[PDB]
């Protein structure tokens, strides 16, 4: 065990190892401080989880979160530098702190040149290929979930309405949506980077879908055959039929290859959207694409998601993950 020190930071105590110095509050959801990591010489972000073990739900969320962050090992996905607790045993274990690279800013704080959009969208797809290869769905892709440093290097995390980037099938509350909902979000972000405007700034879920169908058109026959819900079908079929808009007209002035890729990402029927791996080979990324440097992820065991355990059990599991953590090289 290293040596800890305690300080108060905005009605919130912090007990961190001496390796982390000069803590400076940085914003809240858990609470986060900037620090300097004396072991590496790097600026780090330290998140203290709040009430990680208050309820079975929080406890399982805490475990979720730590297992996920321990597994993500890719240049365009947030990685875990360190995890620690000031607790000396399972008995006294109550607090969890996560350490990551301090990221410059988000995508939210930044119309962009076509080459900038190429590189940023490339990095998102490259990270998402990786995430999707472990059978994870991000589900919350939006500019504020993308950290971008001054070199335009990009990492996906999960800390402007979320709903504006959500796939129309989620708006429709389809129970079996899949990983292509993330590709939808990337299409919405890409559009926003090209035009400087939110593509679908819906005020709620009804308005969200309405704006979506305005661009992409009402469901064709092939898609309507896949809808099980009678109510959803009455809704859909009762709408004034709209054709898919011409994306060339709508995005006139934008690189035709960016237009082509948007067409491939924002297809209404999710079975027809381009995957992340396919999008990487798209001609729009010829500057960047390297098929031998787009790794997939180690197998990821998410079987714990189906399990119903006591709070102390999820707490014990989390402690095990804390203790087993091996820092990155
Ligand atoms: O907290 C989170 N990030 C920020 C973070 C972390 C550590 C150290 C300092 C910070 C600071 F300082 F940047 F916030 C985070 C949490 C959860 C999560 C997951 C499941 N349940 C609950 C929460 N997931 N992702 C995530 C990662 C990759 C991905 F593809 C999708 C999401 C996160 O980045
Ligand atoms: F108005 C609509 C109708 C269908 C969608 C949709 C897009 N991709 N997949 C679906 C879908 C598939 C199976 N069942 C559902 F309920 C939805 C989105 C909005």
UniProtKB/Swiss-Prot annotation:
<keyword id="KW-0832">Ubl conjugation</keyword>
<dbReference type="GO" id="GO:0007166">
    <property type="term" value="P:cell surface receptor signaling pathway"/>
</dbReference>
<dbReference type="GO" id="GO:0035331">
    <property type="term" value="P:negative regulation of hippo signaling"/>
</dbReference>
<dbReference type="GO" id="GO:0019395">
    <property type="term" value="P:fatty acid oxidation"/>
</dbReference>
<dbReference type="GO" id="GO:0000922">
    <property type="term" value="C:spindle pole"/>
</dbReference>
<dbReference type="GO" id="GO:0005524">
    <property type="term" value="F:ATP binding"/>
</dbReference>
<dbReference type="GO" id="GO:0001525">
    <property type="term" value="P:angiogenesis"/>
</dbReference>
<dbReference type="GO" id="GO:0048863">
    <property type="term" value="P:stem cell differentiation"/>
</dbReference>
<dbReference type="GO" id="GO:0007519">
    <property type="term" value="P:skeletal muscle tissue development"/>
</dbReference>
<dbReference type="GO" id="GO:0098978">
    <property type="term" value="C:glutamatergic synapse"/>
</dbReference>
<comment type="function">
    <text>(Microbial infection) Activated by phosphorylation by M.tuberculosis EsxA in T-cells leading to inhibition of IFN-gamma production; phosphorylation is apparent within 15 minutes and is inhibited by kinase-specific inhibitors SB203580 and siRNA.</text>
</comment>
<dbReference type="GO" id="GO:0070935">
    <property type="term" value="P:3'-UTR-mediated mRNA stabilization"/>
</dbReference>
<dbReference type="GO" id="GO:0042770">
    <property type="term" value="P:signal transduction in response to DNA damage"/>
</dbReference>
<dbReference type="GO" id="GO:0090400">
    <property type="term" value="P:stress-induced premature senescence"/>
</dbReference>
<dbReference type="GO" id="GO:0031663">
    <property type="term" value="P:lipopolysaccharide-mediated signaling pathway"/>
</dbReference>
<feature type="binding site">
    <location>
        <begin position="26"/>
        <end position="32"/>
    </location>
    <ligand>
        <name>ATP</name>
    </ligand>
</feature>
<dbReference type="GO" id="GO:0002862">
    <property type="term" value="P:negative regulation of inflammatory response to antigenic stimulus"/>
</dbReference>
<dbReference type="GO" id="GO:0032735">
    <property type="term" value="P:positive regulation of interleukin-12 production"/>
</dbReference>
<dbReference type="GO" id="GO:0005739">
    <property type="term" value="C:mitochondrion"/>
</dbReference>
<keyword id="KW-0547">Nucleotide-binding</keyword>
<dbReference type="InterPro" id="IPR038784">
    <property type="entry name" value="MAPK14"/>
</dbReference>
<dbReference type="GO" id="GO:0000902">
    <property type="term" value="P:cell morphogenesis"/>
</dbReference>
<dbReference type="GO" id="GO:0090090">
    <property type="term" value="P:negative regulation of canonical Wnt signaling pathway"/>
</dbReference>
<dbReference type="GO" id="GO:0004707">
    <property type="term" value="F:MAP kinase activity"/>
</dbReference>
<dbReference type="GO" id="GO:0098586">
    <property type="term" value="P:cellular response to virus"/>
</dbReference>
<dbReference type="InterPro" id="IPR050117">
    <property type="entry name" value="MAP_kinase"/>
</dbReference>
<dbReference type="GO" id="GO:2000379">
    <property type="term" value="P:positive regulation of reactive oxygen species metabolic process"/>
</dbReference>
<dbReference type="GO" id="GO:1900015">
    <property type="term" value="P:regulation of cytokine production involved in inflammatory response"/>
</dbReference>
<dbReference type="GO" id="GO:0005829">
    <property type="term" value="C:cytosol"/>
</dbReference>
<dbReference type="GO" id="GO:0001649">
    <property type="term" value="P:osteoblast differentiation"/>
</dbReference>
<dbReference type="GO" id="GO:0035994">
    <property type="term" value="P:response to muscle stretch"/>
</dbReference>
<dbReference type="GO" id="GO:0046323">
    <property type="term" value="P:D-glucose import"/>
</dbReference>
<keyword id="KW-0007">Acetylation</keyword>
<dbReference type="GO" id="GO:0016607">
    <property type="term" value="C:nuclear speck"/>
</dbReference>
<dbReference type="GO" id="GO:0007178">
    <property type="term" value="P:cell surface receptor protein serine/threonine kinase signaling pathway"/>
</dbReference>
<dbReference type="GO" id="GO:0005737">
    <property type="term" value="C:cytoplasm"/>
</dbReference>
<dbReference type="GO" id="GO:0006006">
    <property type="term" value="P:glucose metabolic process"/>
</dbReference>
<dbReference type="GO" id="GO:0001890">
    <property type="term" value="P:placenta development"/>
</dbReference>
<dbReference type="GO" id="GO:0031098">
    <property type="term" value="P:stress-activated protein kinase signaling cascade"/>
</dbReference>
<dbReference type="GO" id="GO:0048273">
    <property type="term" value="F:mitogen-activated protein kinase p38 binding"/>
</dbReference>
<dbReference type="GO" id="GO:0071493">
    <property type="term" value="P:cellular response to UV-B"/>
</dbReference>
<feature type="modified residue" description="Phosphothreonine">
    <location>
        <position position="12"/>
    </location>
</feature>
């Amino acid at each position: 065990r290293p040596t800890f020190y305690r300080q108060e930071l905005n009605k919130t105590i912090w007990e961190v190892p001496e390796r982390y110095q000069n803590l400076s509050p940085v914003g809240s959801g858990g609470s986060v401080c900037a620090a300097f990591d004396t072991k590496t010489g790097l600026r780090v972000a330290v998140k203290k989880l709040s009430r990680p073990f208050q309820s079975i739900i929080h406890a399982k969320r805490t475990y979720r979160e730590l297992r996920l962050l321990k597994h993500m090992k890719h240049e365009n996905v947030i990685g875990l530098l360190d995890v620690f607790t000031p607790a000396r045993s399972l008995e006294e274990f109550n607090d969890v702190y996560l350490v990551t690279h301090l990221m410059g800013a988000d995508l939210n704080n930044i119309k962009l040149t076509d080459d900038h959009v190429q590189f940023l969208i490339y990095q998102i797809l490259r990270g998402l290929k990786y995430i999707h290869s472990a059978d994870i769905i991000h589900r919350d892709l939006k500019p504020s979930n993308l950290a971008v440093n001054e070199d335009c290097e990009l990492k996906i995390l999960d800390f402007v309405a979320t709903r504006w980037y959500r796939a129309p099938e989620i708006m429709l509350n389809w129970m079996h949506y899949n990983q292509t909902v993330d590709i939808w979000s990337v299409g919405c972000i890409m559009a926003e980077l090209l035009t400087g405007r939110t593509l679908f700034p819906g005020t709620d879920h009804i308005d969200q879908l309405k704006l979506i169908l305005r661009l992409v058109g009402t469901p064709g026959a092939e898609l309507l055959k896949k809808i099980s819900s009678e109510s959803a079908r009455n809704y859909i079929q009762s709408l004034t039929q709209m054709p898919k808009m011409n994306f060339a007209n709508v995005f006139i002035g934008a690189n035709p290859l960016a237009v082509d890729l948007l067409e491939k990402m924002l297809v209404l029927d999710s079975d027809k959207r381009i995957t992340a791996a396919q999008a990487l080979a798209h001609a729009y990324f010829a500057q960047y694409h390297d098929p031998d440097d787009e790794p997939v992820a180690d197998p990821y065991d998410q079987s714990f998601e189906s399990r119903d355990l006591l709070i102390d059990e999820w707490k014990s599991l989390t402690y095990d993950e804390v203790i087993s953590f091996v820092p990155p090289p």
